[PDB]
Short mmCIF file of C-alpha atoms and ligand atoms in Angstrom, two decimals:
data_model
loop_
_atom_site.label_atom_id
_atom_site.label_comp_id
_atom_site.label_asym_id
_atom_site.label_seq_id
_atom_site.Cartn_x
_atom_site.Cartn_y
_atom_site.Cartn_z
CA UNK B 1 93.55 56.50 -74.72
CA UNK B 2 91.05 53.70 -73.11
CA UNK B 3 91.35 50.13 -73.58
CA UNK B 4 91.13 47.00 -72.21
CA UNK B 5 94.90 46.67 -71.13
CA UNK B 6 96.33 47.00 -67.76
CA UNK B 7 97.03 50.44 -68.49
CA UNK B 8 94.61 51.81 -69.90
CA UNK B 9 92.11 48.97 -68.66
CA UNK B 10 88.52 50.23 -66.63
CA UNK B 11 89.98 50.92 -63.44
CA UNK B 12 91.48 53.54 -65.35
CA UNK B 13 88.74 55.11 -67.19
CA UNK B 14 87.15 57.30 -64.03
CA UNK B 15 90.28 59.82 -64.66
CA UNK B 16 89.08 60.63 -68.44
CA UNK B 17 85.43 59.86 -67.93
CA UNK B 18 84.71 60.63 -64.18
CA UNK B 19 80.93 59.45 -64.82
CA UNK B 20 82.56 56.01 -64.58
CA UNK B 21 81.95 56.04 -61.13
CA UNK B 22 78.64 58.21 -61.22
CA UNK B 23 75.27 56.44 -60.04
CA UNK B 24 73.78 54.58 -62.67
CA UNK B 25 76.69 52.71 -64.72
CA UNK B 26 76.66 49.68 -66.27
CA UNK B 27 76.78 46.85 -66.16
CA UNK B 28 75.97 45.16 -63.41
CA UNK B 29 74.93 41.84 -61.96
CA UNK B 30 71.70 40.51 -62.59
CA UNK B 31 70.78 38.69 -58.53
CA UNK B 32 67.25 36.79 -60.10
CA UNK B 33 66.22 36.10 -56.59
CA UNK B 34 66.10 39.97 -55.95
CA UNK B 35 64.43 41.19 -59.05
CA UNK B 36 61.22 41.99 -58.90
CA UNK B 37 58.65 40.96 -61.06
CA UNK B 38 56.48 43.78 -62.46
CA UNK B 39 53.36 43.03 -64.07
CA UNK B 40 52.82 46.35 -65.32
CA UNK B 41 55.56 45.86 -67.64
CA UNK B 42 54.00 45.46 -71.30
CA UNK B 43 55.51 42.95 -73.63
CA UNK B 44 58.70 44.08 -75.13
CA UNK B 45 58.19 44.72 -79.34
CA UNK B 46 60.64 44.19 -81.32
CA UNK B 47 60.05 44.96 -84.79
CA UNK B 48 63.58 44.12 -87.58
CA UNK B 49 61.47 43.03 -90.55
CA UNK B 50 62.36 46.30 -92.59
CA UNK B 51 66.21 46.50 -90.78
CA UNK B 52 68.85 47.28 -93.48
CA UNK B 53 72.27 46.77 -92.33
CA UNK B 54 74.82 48.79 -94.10
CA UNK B 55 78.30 48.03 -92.82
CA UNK B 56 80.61 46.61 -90.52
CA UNK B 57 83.59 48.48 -88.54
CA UNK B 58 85.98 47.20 -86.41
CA UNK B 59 86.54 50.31 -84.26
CA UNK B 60 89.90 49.09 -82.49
CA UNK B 61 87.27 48.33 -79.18
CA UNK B 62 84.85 46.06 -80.90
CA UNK B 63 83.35 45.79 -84.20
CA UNK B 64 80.32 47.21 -84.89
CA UNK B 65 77.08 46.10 -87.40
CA UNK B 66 75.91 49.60 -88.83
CA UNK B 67 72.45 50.30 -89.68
CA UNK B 68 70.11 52.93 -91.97
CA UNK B 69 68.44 54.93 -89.08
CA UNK B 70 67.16 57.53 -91.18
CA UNK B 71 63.67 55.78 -91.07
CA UNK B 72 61.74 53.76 -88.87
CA UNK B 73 62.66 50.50 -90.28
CA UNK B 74 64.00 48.76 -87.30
CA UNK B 75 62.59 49.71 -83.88
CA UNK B 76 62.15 48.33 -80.10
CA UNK B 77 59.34 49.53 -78.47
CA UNK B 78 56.49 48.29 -75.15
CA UNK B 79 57.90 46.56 -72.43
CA UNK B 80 59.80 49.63 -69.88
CA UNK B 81 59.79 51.69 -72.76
CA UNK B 82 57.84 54.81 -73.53
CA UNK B 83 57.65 55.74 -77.26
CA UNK B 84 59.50 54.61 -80.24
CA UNK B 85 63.74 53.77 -79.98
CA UNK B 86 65.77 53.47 -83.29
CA UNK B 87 68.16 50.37 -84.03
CA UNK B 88 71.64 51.87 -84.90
CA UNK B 89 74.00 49.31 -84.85
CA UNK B 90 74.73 45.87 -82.66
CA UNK B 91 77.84 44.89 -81.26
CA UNK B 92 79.61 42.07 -79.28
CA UNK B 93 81.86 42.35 -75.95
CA UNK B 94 83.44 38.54 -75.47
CA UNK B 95 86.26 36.32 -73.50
CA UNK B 96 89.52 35.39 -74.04
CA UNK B 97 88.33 31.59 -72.64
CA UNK B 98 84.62 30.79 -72.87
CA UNK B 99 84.13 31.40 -69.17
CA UNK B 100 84.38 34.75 -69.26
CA UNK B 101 83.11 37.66 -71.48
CA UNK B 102 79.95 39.15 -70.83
CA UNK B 103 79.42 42.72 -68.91
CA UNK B 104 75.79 41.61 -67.33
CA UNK B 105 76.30 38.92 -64.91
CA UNK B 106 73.39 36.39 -63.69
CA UNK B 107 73.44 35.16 -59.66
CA UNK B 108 77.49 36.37 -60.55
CA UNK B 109 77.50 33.65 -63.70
CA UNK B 110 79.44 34.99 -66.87
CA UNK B 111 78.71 34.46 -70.04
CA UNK B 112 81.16 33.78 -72.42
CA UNK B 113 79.60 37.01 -74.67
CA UNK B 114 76.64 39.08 -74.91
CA UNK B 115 75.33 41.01 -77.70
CA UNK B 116 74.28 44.93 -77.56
CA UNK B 117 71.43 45.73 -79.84
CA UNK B 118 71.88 49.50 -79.83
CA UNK B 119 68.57 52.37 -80.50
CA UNK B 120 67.96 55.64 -79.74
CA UNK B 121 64.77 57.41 -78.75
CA UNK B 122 63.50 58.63 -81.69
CA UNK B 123 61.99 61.82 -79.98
CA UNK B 124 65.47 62.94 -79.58
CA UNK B 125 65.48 63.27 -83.26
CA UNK B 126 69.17 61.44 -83.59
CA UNK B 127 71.58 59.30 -81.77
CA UNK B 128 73.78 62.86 -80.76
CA UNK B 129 71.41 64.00 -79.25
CA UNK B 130 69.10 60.82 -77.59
CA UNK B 131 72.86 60.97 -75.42
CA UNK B 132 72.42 63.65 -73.61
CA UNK B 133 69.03 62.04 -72.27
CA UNK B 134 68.60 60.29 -69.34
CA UNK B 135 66.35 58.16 -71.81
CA UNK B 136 67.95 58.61 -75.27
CA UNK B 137 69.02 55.01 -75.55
CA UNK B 138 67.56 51.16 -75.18
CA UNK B 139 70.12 48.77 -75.69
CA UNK B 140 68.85 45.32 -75.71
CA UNK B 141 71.17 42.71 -74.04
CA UNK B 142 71.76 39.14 -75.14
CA UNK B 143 73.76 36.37 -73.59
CA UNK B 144 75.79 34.02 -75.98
CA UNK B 145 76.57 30.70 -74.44
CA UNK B 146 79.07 27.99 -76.07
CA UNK B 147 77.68 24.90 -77.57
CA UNK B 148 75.73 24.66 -81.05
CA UNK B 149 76.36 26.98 -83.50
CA UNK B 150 73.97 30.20 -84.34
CA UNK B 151 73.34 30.00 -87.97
CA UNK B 152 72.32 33.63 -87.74
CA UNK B 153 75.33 34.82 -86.55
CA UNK B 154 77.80 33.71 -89.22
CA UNK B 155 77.43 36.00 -92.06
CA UNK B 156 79.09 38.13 -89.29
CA UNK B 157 81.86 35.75 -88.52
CA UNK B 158 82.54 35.05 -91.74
CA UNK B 159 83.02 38.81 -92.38
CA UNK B 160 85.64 39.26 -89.52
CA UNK B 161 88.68 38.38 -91.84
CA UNK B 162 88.31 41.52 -93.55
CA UNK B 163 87.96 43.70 -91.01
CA UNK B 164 91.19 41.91 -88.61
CA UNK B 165 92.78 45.52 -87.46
CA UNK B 166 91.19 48.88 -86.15
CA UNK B 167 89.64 51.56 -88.73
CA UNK B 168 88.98 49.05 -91.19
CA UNK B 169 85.04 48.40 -92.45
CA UNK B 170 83.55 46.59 -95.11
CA UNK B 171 79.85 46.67 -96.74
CA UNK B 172 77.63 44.60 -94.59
CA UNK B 173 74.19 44.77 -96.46
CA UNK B 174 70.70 42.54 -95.88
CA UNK B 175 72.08 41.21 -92.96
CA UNK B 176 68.99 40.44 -90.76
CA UNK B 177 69.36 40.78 -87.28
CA UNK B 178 66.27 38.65 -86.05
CA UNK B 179 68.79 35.17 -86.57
CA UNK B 180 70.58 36.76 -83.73
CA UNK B 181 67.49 36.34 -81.08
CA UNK B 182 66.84 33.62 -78.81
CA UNK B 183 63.19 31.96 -78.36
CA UNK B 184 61.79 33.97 -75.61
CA UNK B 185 61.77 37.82 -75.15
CA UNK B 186 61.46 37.35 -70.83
CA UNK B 187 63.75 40.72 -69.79
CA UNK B 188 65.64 42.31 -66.85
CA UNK B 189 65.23 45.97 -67.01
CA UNK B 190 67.22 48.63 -65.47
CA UNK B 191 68.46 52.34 -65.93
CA UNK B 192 72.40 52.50 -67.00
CA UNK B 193 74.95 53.65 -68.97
CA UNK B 194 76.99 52.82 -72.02
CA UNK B 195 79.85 50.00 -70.65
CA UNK B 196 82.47 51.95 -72.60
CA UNK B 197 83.58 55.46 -72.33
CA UNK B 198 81.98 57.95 -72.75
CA UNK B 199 80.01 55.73 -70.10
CA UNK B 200 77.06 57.98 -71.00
CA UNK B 201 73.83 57.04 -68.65
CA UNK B 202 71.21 57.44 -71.28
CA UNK B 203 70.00 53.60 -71.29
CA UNK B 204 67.42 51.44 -70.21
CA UNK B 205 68.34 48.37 -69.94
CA UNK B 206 66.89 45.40 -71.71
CA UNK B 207 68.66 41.99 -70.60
CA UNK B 208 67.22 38.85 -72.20
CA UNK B 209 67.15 36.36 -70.06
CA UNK B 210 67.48 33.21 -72.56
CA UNK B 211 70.74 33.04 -73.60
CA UNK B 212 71.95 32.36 -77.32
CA UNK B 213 74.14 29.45 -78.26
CA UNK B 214 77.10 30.16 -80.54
CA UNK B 215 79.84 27.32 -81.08
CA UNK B 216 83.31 27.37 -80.41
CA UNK B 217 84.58 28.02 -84.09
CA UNK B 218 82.36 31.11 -83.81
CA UNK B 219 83.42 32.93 -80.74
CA UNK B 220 86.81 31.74 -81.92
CA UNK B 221 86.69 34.17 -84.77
CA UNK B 222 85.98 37.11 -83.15
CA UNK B 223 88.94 35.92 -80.76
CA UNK B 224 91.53 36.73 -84.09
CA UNK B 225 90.23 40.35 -84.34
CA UNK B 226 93.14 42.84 -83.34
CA UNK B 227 92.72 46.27 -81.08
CA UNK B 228 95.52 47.04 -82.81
CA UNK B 229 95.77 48.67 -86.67
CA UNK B 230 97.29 47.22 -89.75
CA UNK B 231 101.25 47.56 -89.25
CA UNK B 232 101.23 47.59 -85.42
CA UNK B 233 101.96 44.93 -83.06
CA UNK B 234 99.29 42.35 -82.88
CA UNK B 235 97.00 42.56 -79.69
CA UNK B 236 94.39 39.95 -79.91
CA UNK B 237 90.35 41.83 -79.50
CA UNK B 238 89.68 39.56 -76.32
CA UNK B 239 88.32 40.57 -73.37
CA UNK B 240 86.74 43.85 -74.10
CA UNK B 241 83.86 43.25 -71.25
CA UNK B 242 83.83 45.72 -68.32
CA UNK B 243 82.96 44.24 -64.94
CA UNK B 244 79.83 44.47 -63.05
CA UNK B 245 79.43 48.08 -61.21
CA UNK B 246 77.78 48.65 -57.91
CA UNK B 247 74.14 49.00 -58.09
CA UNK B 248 73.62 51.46 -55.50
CA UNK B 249 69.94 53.02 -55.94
CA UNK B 250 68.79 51.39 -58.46
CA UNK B 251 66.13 47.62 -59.05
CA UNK B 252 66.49 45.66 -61.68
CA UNK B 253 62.51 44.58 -62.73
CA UNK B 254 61.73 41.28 -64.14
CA UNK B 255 59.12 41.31 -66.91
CA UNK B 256 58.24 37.68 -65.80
CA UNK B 257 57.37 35.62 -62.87
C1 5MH J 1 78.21 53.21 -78.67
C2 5MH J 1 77.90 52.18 -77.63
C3 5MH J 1 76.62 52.04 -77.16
C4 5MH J 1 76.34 51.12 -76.22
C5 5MH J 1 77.37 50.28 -75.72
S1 5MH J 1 77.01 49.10 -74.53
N1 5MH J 1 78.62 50.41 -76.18
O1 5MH J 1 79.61 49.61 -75.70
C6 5MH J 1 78.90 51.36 -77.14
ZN1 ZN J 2 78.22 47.26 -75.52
#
């Protein structure tokens, strides 16, 4: 099944998910001098003070931060966005070297991470079903840069040890997902897909475009995650970023000049 290997790698995915090379994946790069600013674009909303985190799951891709969507307790709303969309959980695609990691590019610049801040559109009633919408999904898009630490982020990285191999979860409660957000909320915004199979193209885009700073001993963590499970050879979780896709018919909007 899909990976990150040279097997199993993205050039492979197309022959289990032949979306992969529909016309709207993700992601792509971000060329600033080409996107346009909008001023119709309202300010983007993001509202976590009544998030509540539940767990954490290394799914043999990633790990994922799980949250209580059965309310509207955590939502992103205004800027592209019409209505109301659901956070679900957040997740982290990174580098085996801090010059690589991130699935967004800027002017072809990598990041050495980026954080996915997953919701779905809550007139789709649930997650299932927001993804088989062209809109059923926002994911918001952050950059992680190396140099001081995010204080934010490690409750998660201190969490990582017991979660090393694939299937395994712990509880991950009253974790507060606004220590993960940089200063300003200035966005790209464009229509994609999930970057992993099922490479669904349900999202709008949200891209920040202030990076996060996260040391070295942090991103160094989530380097000693495994793809692999408990008793099976150990394949470090690096490099789980798929590389930019061609844009074809789409612009990428800037919500500021
Ligand atoms: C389930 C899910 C949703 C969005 C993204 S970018 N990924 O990678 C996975
Ligand atoms: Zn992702």
């Amino acid at each position: 099944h899909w990976g990150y290997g040279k097997h199993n790698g993205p050039e492979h995915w197309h022959k289990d998910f032949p979306i992969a090379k529909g016309e709207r994946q993700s992601p792509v790069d971000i060329d600033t001098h080409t996107a346009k600013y909008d001023p119709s674009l309202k300010p983007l909303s993001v509202s976590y003070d009544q998030a509540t985190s539940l767990r954490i799951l290394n799914n043999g891709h990633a790990f994922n931060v799980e949250f209580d969507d059965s309310q509207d307790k955590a939502v992103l709303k205004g800027g592209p966005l019409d209505g109301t969309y659901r956070l679900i959980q957040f997740h982290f695609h990174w580098g085996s070297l801090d010059g690589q990691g991130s699935e967004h590019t800027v002017d072809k610049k990598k990041y050495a991470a980026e954080l996915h801040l997953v919701h779905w559109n809550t007139k789709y009633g649930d997650f299932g079903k927001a993804v088989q919408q062209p809109d059923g999904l926002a994911v918001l898009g952050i950059f992680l840069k190396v140099g001081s630490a995010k204080p934010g982020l490690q409750k998660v990285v201190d969490v990582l040890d017991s979660i090393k191999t694939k299937g395994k979860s712990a509880d991950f409660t009253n974790f507060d997902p606004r220590g993960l957000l940089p200063e300003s909320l200035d966005y790209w915004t464009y229509p994609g897909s999930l970057t992993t199979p099922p490479l669904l193209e349900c999202v709008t885009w949200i891209v920040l475009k202030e990076p996060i700073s996260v040391s070295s001993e942090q991103v160094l963590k989530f380097r000693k995650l495994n793809f692999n499970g408990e008793g099976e050879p150990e394949e470090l979780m690096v490099d789980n970023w798929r590389p930019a896709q061609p844009l074809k018919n789409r612009q990428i909007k800037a919500s500021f000049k």
